[PDB]
Structure 1
Amino acid sequence: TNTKGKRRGTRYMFSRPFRKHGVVPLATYMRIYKKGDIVDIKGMGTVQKGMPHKCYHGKTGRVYNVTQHAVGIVVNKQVKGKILAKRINVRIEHIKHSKSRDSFLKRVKENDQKKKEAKEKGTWVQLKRQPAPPREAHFVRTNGKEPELLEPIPYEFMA
């Protein structure tokens, strides 16, 4: 039977990677975290204050509050069927912005433009992603040479 400590099973997670111990490179601090931003979590164990629980390491969330040194985050959690929403206060050096929406943002702006410009033309051009389709009947050249000829090889008890 297992125990109930708050850091049971974190020998490696709350552990700094190879040749990256030391002081903290401090563009981490100078970033700007406004409300409504989407954020991912990763516990740095170099500093112990305000770090979250194991269950939130690797989860993504959303901001609702802002303090002097920390941030409030809304995170979902699956516990026995039902899912719950949770409001964990977390300090800055355990977070990072997420690029999981910038792709969407490049599109809507390009897409707004590409609509408005080239609207006078009259055509409703493609605006929405499509999957990978089949592959385009085409020719193949044998610029002279006959192909190579392969065959299997005999076995050998090389070791």
Structure 2
Amino acid sequence: HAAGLRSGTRYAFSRGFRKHGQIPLSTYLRTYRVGDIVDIKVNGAVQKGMPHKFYHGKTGVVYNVTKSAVGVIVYKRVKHRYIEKRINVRIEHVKPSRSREDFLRRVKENAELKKKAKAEGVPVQLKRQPAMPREAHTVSIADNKPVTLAPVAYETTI
């Protein structure tokens, strides 16, 4: 048996059905800054700057920006500890991450909520709550007569 660099990447590194050929150029048109959070997804058509198969499907933080690639910090679990790994990835294997979009939209929503609450004199709720049990309510059967169901007898269908 073998332990080469791209062992077991038959499907992960492959391009999807009817997804071959030309690479969209918005990938190259994107810009990245140090501290940005990016998702790593290996493009099989770009053999330069390929990250190892472990980092495929991982999310990290950009720590270095270069001509055609970014340095990403990932944390890899080995034995009983976490190791900080730094990988140089070409842009084609890097996608900006929505892993923080909810928080980044909540921070500004909370800012406007705070200023509006201060203006209006009544505090509002800034922190999200988990789904709560449903409240009491009344269901009218007017024009919604219940339909009585019974278990069906067994019969063969072949």
TM-score (norm 2): 0.94
For 1:112, the equivalent position in structure 2 comes to 111
For 1:7, the equivalent position in structure 2 comes to 6
- After alignment, is 66-75 or 110-119 more displaced? 110-119
Provide the secondary structure at the position in 2 that maps to 1:116.
Answer: helix
For 1:45, the equivalent position in structure 2 comes to 44
For 1:86, the equivalent position in structure 2 comes to 85
CA distance in 2, matches of 1:41, 1:112: 32
Tell me which amino acid in the other structure corresponds to 2:115. K
Cα shift at 1:144:
5.2
Higher helix residue share: 2
CA distance in 1, matches of 2:153, 2:80: 57
Provide the secondary structure at the position in 1 that maps to 2:119.
Answer: coil
Superposed counterparts of 1:58-77, under 5 Å: 58-77=57-76
CA distance in 2, matches of 1:145, 1:102: 43
Which of structure 1's runs of 4+ aligned residues deviate more than 6 A?
none
Provide the secondary structure at the position in 1 that maps to 2:118.
Answer: coil
**Identity rate, percent:** 62
- After alignment, is 138-147 or 88-97 more displaced? 138-147
For residues 102-134 of structure 1, what are the alpha-carbon distances to aligned partners after superposition, in whole Å with 9 as ceiling and x for unaligned?
A: 111111111111111231333222111101111
For residues 69-98 of structure 1, what are the alpha-carbon distances to aligned partners after superposition, in whole Å with 9 as ceiling and x for unaligned?
A: 111010000111211001111100001001
For 1:100, the equivalent position in structure 2 comes to 99
Aligned residues: 158
Distance 1:86 1:154, change over 3 A: same
Cα shift at 1:145:
5.9
Uncovered stretches (5+) of structure 2, i.e. residues with no partner? none
CA distance in 1, matches of 2:13, 2:147: 55
Q: CA RMSD in A?
A: 1.3
Contact in 1 for aligned 2:75/2:83 (Cα 8 Å): yes
CA distance in 2, matches of 1:129, 1:144: 38
Distance 1:142 1:90, change over 3 A: same
Cα shift at 1:158:
2.1
Distance 1:33 1:146, change over 3 A: closer
CA distance in 2, matches of 1:132, 1:63: 35
TM-score (norm 1): 0.94
Uncovered stretches (5+) of structure 1, i.e. residues with no partner? none
